[PDB]
Amino acid sequence: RRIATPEEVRLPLQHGWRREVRIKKGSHRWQGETWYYGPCGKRMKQFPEVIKYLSRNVVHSVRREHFSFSPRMPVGDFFEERDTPEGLQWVQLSAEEIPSRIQAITG
Amino acid sequence: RRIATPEEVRLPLQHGWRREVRIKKGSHRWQGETWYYGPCGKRMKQFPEVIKYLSRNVVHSVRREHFSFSPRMPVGDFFEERDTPEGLQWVQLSAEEIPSRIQAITG
DNA sequence: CGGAATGTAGGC
DNA sequence: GCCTACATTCCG
């Protein structure tokens, strides 16, 4: 029932999980969404999918409080949808671009 | 054509792609399969799917010559399915573990 | 909430 | 072409 630290949200990355934050133009504004990949490669987009995955897989070091769906938590790889006359390209952000995208979707 | 070098296979990884090798036991032996994730998040497991992906986006730094589906090419993250009394369980391999696993899927 | 029903995409 | 495996919708 209390705030998760960056250290804790980095922990599943040391146990075969991946976290991604993806930032697209929505109906009205710029918004971010968080994806997790389980060690098996399963893509999960919602916290109840993670709790369901944890309940049907061997309970090691990784537990429910290690997970955040916040696109404003700087843990994992960041991508954004950049539209140009050549078309919709997705591009991965450098570590240096990330804090300004997070500011842009704070609020 | 010509077999791609580690360096060429690492190129798309600087332009928002991910490469994974995933090993498990089949009928008689252990086998590897290569996955790629495009910068949009799309999972592709076959060479002609990457060709279809590349022709649907703008042709820049990334071309067909940079893609290998060979699970013996030590580029990207490696994982294996281990059968245990608690169930099938995927684990990410350390750099130190990868060579034994590639030797085991040659053949 | 935890599973069954139905839809879809890519594999063969 | 159908089949298999995953994603989404539906249900009490």
From Swiss-Prot, chains A, B:
It is found in: Nucleus, Nucleolus. Deacetylation by SIRT1 in late S phase enhances pRNA-binding, allowing de novo DNA methylation and heterochromatin formation. Acetylation is high during S phase and declines to background levels in late S phase when the silent copies of rRNA genes are replicated. Ubiquitinated. Deubiquitinated by USP21 leading to its stabilization. It comes from the Eukaryota. Expressed at moderate levels in most tissues analyzed, including heart, brain, placenta, lung, skeletal muscle, kidney and pancreas. The modification Phosphothreonine is found at T5. Residues 3-74 form the MBD domain. The modification Phosphoserine is found at S70. The bromo domain and the PHD-type zinc finger recognize and bind histone H4 acetylated on 'Lys-16' (H4K16ac). These 2 domains play a central role in the recruitment of chromatin silencing proteins such as DNMT1, DNMT3B and HDAC1. The MBD (methyl-CpG-binding) domain, also named TAM domain, specifically recognizes and binds a conserved stem-loop structure the association within pRNA. Binding to pRNA induces a conformational change of BAZ2A/TIP5 and is essential for targeting the NoRC complex to the nucleolus. Component of the NoRC-1 ISWI chromatin remodeling complex at least composed of SMARCA1 and BAZ2A/TIP5, which regulates the spacing of histone octamers on the DNA template to facilitate access to DNA. Within the NoRC-1 ISWI chromatin remodeling complex interacts with SMARCA1; the interaction is direct. Component of the NoRC-5 ISWI chromatin remodeling complex (also called the NoRC nucleolar-remodeling complex), at least composed of SMARCA5/SNF2H and BAZ2A/TIP5, which regulates the spacing of histone octamers on the DNA template to facilitate access to DNA. Regulatory subunit of the ATP-dependent NoRC-1 and NoRC-5 ISWI chromatin remodeling complexes, which form ordered nucleosome arrays on chromatin and facilitate access to DNA during DNA-templated processes such as DNA replication, transcription, and repair. Both complexes regulate the spacing of nucleosomes along the chromatin and have the ability to slide mononucleosomes to the center of a DNA template. Directly stimulates the ATPase activity of SMARCA5 in the NoRC-5 ISWI chromatin remodeling complex. Belongs to the WAL family. This is Bromodomain adjacent to zinc finger domain protein 2A. It comes from Homo sapiens. The chain holds residues 544 to 650 of 1905 of the full protein.
